[PDB]
């Protein structure tokens, strides 16, 4: 692909074929001239070095390197280890409708309610705002609603207030220690730039209030909108599965 600087960049496979394709051509050119048999057997070495090098670089001997004096990424290292396609792009991934902040404590809440800041929650629900704009008809078209989202009419804060009521949200903290790694709250909107929690569930995460990064998630489908209510509301688990005494202990 052409790059942002106007140069190019290739993956490592697209020159290793240029080792195999070139050393293929040097063989078919050779056999119709019939060189003696100390040159011809040396040719069949390098294909077996090269059809190695398509399959694996760092296996059979000293690896085949590019200009950076570093080993070339083979086809085997596409599948091998934590760098491969398994643990970095197949099991865990990235996901959309996401965000993060510093965490802080607000004890004016109830148990199931958690904070959610304003100018985070404007991007985090942008498909919800467009649909409810086209349903009331205050927005004539989709592009007009994107034109009106910078106008910031007061009804936009009302339609967002309409849509965030009883729509649950997930709270996360990496790394997940056990089953209480993620819960589900109902949001309550404040005007700041930080996520507020309830103070009793800090011991469940083993998160202390000194600069973590807790992440949010928004369930899209109708079933998961029930599944937050049905399994992972903070009230529906006070029993930590390790041992049948409550994790909601005064800390």
């Amino acid at each position: 692909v052409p790059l942002d600087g106007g140069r190019f960049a290739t993956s490592d496979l697209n020159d290793l074929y240029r080792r195999v394709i070139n050393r293929n051509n040097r063989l078919k050119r050779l056999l119709d001239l019939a060189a003696p048999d100390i040159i011809v057997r040396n040719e069949k070495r390098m294909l077996q070095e090269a059809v190695d090098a398509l399959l694996d670089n760092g296996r059979r001997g000293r690896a085949i390197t590019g200009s950076n004096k570093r080993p070339l990424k083979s086809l085997a290292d596409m599948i091998k280890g934590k760098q491969g396609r398994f643990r970095q792009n197949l099991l865990g991934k990235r996901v959309d409708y996401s965000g993060r902040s510093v965490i802080t404590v607000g004890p004016y809440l109830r148990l199931h309610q958690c904070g959610l800041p304003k100018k985070m929650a404007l991007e985090l629900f942008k498909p919800f705002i467009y649909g409810k704009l086209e349903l009331r008809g205050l927005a004539t078209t989709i592009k007009a609603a994107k034109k009106m989202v910078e106008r910031e009419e007061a009804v936009v804060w009302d339609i967002l207030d309409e849509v965030i009521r009883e729509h649950p949200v997930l709270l996360n903290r990496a790394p997940t220690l056990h089953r209480l790694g993620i819960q589900a709250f109902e949001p309550v909107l404040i005007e700041g730039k930080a996520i507020q929690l309830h103070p009793l569930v800090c011991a469940a995460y083993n998160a202390d209030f000194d600069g973590d990064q807790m992440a949010v998630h928004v369930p899209l489908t109708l079933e998961a909108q029930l599944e937050a209510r049905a399994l992972m509301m903070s009230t529906n688990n006070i029993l930590s599965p390790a041992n049948g005494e409550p994790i909601i202990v005064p800390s």
């Binding site: 040396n42 070495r45 390098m46 070095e49 059979r60 001997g61 000293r62």
Partner: peptide, 11 residues
């Protein structure tokens, strides 16, 4: 006990 093909050619 060598395996690198640089030495195998010059031998």
């Amino acid at each position: 006990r060598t395996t690198d093909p640089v030495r195998m050619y010059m031998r």
